[PDB]
């Protein structure tokens, strides 16, 4: 009915001996691999809880948020999710103060929109150098605020691929009372993140799998067809460069 265990050929395993001990409740006693394998049943109920909460939030008529910062593949991935579902996101660095304070960023996004409409209405009546420089800060503002622009208040919920790399983001979310869901690797700290999904974020194929199922789990509540969610088979398998070598130097 939903994401059988057959897909899990390599989505468990992380750098050895680099695991927070308090989260071992999700991990069975170690094998010789030393790459921390998981329990897929608890994985399934975690995804089920995440799905029935994100669907509820989407039908609750709220705004959710997406976070991605790792080098290329997660950034292009969240870009694909955004171009596939009309919803805000972040691609560049988390601004360190994005959510705990919003007036000083709401004014900036409003200035972004004002300059966007200024270009949209001006028929190059300004000087050529003036048009050039105006487009220059337009490019900068699209680069930094491209994702978070279709919102008025702070998001009712947000996701994150790796709370460890987004310690700033998850910390700012925890400061406020808004919940958070994460793709918690073996080095995360479970008590911080509200809803835990023990998935391997080192392998790009696992990342695309998980965020695509999440995207369809929210798009089905958005009335869009769930391409990867509730799909039986022969759709989950996504192209991937050779995905192995879980340990890292």
């Amino acid at each position: 009915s939903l994401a059988k265990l057959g897909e899990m050929r390599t989505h468990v395993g992380m750098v050895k001996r680099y695991w927070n001990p308090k989260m071992g409740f999700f991990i069975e006693p170690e094998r010789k691999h030393n790459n921390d394998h998981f329990v897929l049943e608890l994985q399934r109920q975690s995804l089920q809880t995440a799905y029935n909460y994100v669907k509820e939030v989407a039908q609750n008529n709220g705004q959710i948020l997406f976070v991605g910062t790792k080098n290329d593949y997660v950034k292009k991935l969240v870009n694909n999710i955004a171009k596939r579902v009309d919803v805000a996101f972040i691609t560049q660095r988390w601004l360190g103060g994005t959510l705990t304070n919003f007036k000083t960023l709401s004014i900036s996004i409003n200035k972004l929109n004002k300059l966007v409409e200024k270009q949209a209405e001006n028929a190059a009546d300004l000087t050529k150098k003036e048009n050039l420089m105006l487009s220059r800060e337009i490019e900068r503002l699209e680069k930094f605020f491209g994702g978070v622009k279709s919102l008025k208040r702070l998001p009712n919920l947000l996701i994150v691929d790796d709370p460890v790399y987004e310690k700033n983001a998850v910390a700012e979310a925890n400061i406020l009372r808004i919940p958070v869901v994460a793709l918690c690797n073996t080095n995360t700290n479970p008590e911080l993140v509200d809803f835990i999904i023990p998935a391997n974020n080192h392998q790009p194929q696992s990342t695309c799998l998980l965020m695509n199922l999440l995207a369809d789990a929210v798009a089905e509540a958005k009335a869009m067809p769930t391409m990867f969610a509730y799909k039986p088979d022969e759709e989950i398998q996504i192209e991937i460069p050779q995905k192995q070598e879980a340990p890292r130097q």
Binding site: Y53, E56, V57, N60, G62, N156, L157, P179, D194
Partner: peptide, 5 residues
């Protein structure tokens, strides 16, 4: 948190 609202 039980539910959203």
């Amino acid at each position: 948190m039980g539910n959203f609202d």
